[PDB]
C-alpha cells in the first residue's frame, strides 16, 4: 500500500525567463506586451471632430477648409496629414505650442473684437482663398491703403478681454513679393506693427522680397498669437502690412488631440491612440508605438515578455 504526492504537467509546455534560466518551461503563461492593434479611432463616448483638410491652426484664422470648424467643440480632435492651416501661403510663429494648446482646448468659442476702420480698405482678398470667388481668411481682415500707392494712416486698435478665461488673439504680417508691391498696397516708407499687452511686448517689420511660388503666390503671411489674460487689453499699433483679427477665440474646456491616418469608429470604445489606431488592452506594456497618447500601457522594446501563470513543467517519466 502506497500514497504519492504529485503535481500536474503537460506536453504543451511554454518557455519563459527567470533570473537564472532562459527558456525554462512552465505549464501555462500569458503575454504582458500588447501587440494587437485596432486600425481605427474608437470614438464611442467621445465627441469627435475629423479636421480632414482643415489644419488645426486654421480653425482660428479661417481658410475655406475650416469654415465648418470656426467654433467647433470636441472631446477628441484628429489632425490629418492633408490638413492645412493656410490658404494664402504662410505659417505661424510658435506653431507647435499653439497646436498643443488647441488639442486640449475642447474646441473654440469665437467672439467679435469690434475693430472699426476709416480711410482704408478692408476687403483684401486673394485667389488662393477661393470661397465662391476670391476671398480671405474668415476671421481676419486684410487691410489696404484706399486707392493704390496711397499712404496708409497710422492706426491704433485695442481690445479688452472682459471674460474670465484667457483670449486667444491672432494677427498677421504680410510680406509682399517686392517693395513695389508693398508700396502699391500700403504706401511708401517703412512699415511698423507693435503689439502691446500687460505681460507681452513684441514688434514687427515686414520683409518684402521674392520667394518661391506657393499656390501660385510668392508673398507670405506669417501669423502671430498671444494669450490675453482676463480684464487685460491688447493694443495694435500699425501703418500697413497688418493682417487684423476680427474675432478672438476662447477655449471651451478639455479635450485630447491626435494625428492619425486611419478611419474613425464610433462603435468601439478606446482611451489609448496612435497614428495607426487604438490600443485597447489591460496589459501593462505595449510594443506598438512609443509616441502613443492618452491612457496607455508603457511602451517597451520587446515584442513579447511571457508571464508564468503556472508551475514549472516537469514531464512524466514514461
Amino acid at each position: 500500500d502506497k500514497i504519492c504526492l504529485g503535481h500536474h504537467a503537460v506536453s504543451n509546455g511554454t518557455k519563459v525567463n527567470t533570473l537564472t534560466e532562459r527558456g525554462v518551461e512552465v505549464v501555462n503563461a500569458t503575454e504582458t506586451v500588447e501587440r494587437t492593434n485596432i486600425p481605427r479611432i474608437c470614438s464611442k463616448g467621445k465627441r469627435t471632430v475629423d479636421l480632414g483638410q482643415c489644419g488645426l491652426l486654421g480653425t482660428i484664422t479661417g481658410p475655406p477648409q475650416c469654415d465648418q470648424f470656426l467654433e467647433f467643440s470636441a472631446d477628441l480632435i484628429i489632425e490629418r496629414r492633408e490638413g492645412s492651416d493656410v490658404c494664402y501661403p504662410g505659417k505661424f510663429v510658435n506653431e507647435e505650442a499653439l497646436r498643443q494648446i488647441l488639442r486640449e482646448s475642447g474646441g473654440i468659442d469665437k467672439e467679435a473684437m469690434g475693430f472699426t476702420y476709416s480711410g482704408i480698405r478692408t476687403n483684401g482678398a486673394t485667389s488662393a482663398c477661393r470661397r465662391s470667388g476670391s476671398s480671405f481668411y474668415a476671421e481676419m481682415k486684410w487691410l489696404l491703403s484706399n486707392t493704390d500707392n496711397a499712404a496708409f494712416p497710422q492706426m491704433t486698435k485695442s481690445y479688452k478681454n472682459t471674460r474670465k478665461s484667457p483670449a486667444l488673439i491672432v494677427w498677421g504680417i504680410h510680406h509682399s513679393v517686392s517693395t513695389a508691391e508693398q508700396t502699391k498696397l500700403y504706401g511708401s516708407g517703412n512699415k511698423l506693427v507693435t503689439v502691446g499687452s500687460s505681460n507681452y511686448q513684441q514688434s514687427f517689420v515686414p520683409s518684402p522680397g521674392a520667394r518661391p511660388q506657393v499656390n501660385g503666390l510668392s508673398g507670405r503671411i506669417d501669423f502671430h498669437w498671444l494669450m490675453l489674460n482676463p480684464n487685460d487689453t491688447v493694443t495694435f499699433s500699425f501703418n500697413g502690412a497688418f493682417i487684423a483679427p476680427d474675432r478672438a477665440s476662447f477655449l471651451r474646456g478639455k479635450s485630447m488631440g491626435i494625428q492619425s491616418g486611419v478611419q474613425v469608429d464610433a462603435n468601439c470604445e478606446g482611451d489609448c491612440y496612435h497614428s495607426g489606431g487604438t490600443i485597447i488592452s489591460n496589459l501593462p506594456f505595449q510594443n506598438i508605438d512609443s509616441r502613443a497618447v492618452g491612457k496607455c500601457p508603457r511602451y517597451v522594446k520587446q515584442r513579447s515578455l511571457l508571464l508564468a501563470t503556472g508551475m514549472k513543467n516537469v514531464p512524466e517519466i514514461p
Partner: protein, 169 residues
Amino acid sequence: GAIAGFIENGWEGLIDGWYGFRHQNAQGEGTAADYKSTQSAIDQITGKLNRLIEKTNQQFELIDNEFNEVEKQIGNVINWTRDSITEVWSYNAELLVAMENQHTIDLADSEMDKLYERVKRQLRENAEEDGTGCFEIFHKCDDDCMASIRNNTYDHSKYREEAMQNRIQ
C-alpha cells in the same frame, strides 16, 4: 508497474487540479486532486495578474509632431528623453517578469513541499518515504483509508500497532 510522485516527474493525468494524490492498494490505483493546495496556488497567481492589471490614471499628450517635424534642437532633446525613458521601462518590464516568474515557480515548489510534509505528519510512524515523493504505508489502507488521508481524517492511532509491527520486522 510502480507509481511515483514529485521528484523527477509530474503527472500529465492529473487534469482536475495542480496538486494531488496517487495511491495503490488492493483495490488498485487512483488519482485525485487536493483542493486546498491547488486553490492556494491559483489564488496567488491570479493575485499577481490583478496586480499587473491595475491601470494608470496618468494621461500623456503629444509633445512633438509627425506631420510637421519640430525644431531640431528641441526635437533631439525630446527623442533623447523618450528613448531614455523607453530603455528604463524596457528594463523594468524585463526584470519584473523575470522576477515574478522566479517567484511563481518557487512558491509552486513550496506548495508541493507543504502538501508532502502535511501528509508525512498525518501518517506519523505508520509510513516511510520511498524517495520519489511517495509513502510506503505499513498497514492495510483500502480506498476508504486512502480517502481519509486526503481529507485529513486519518487517525494514525488506529493503525499504529499494525504498522510499527510491520516496520520493525
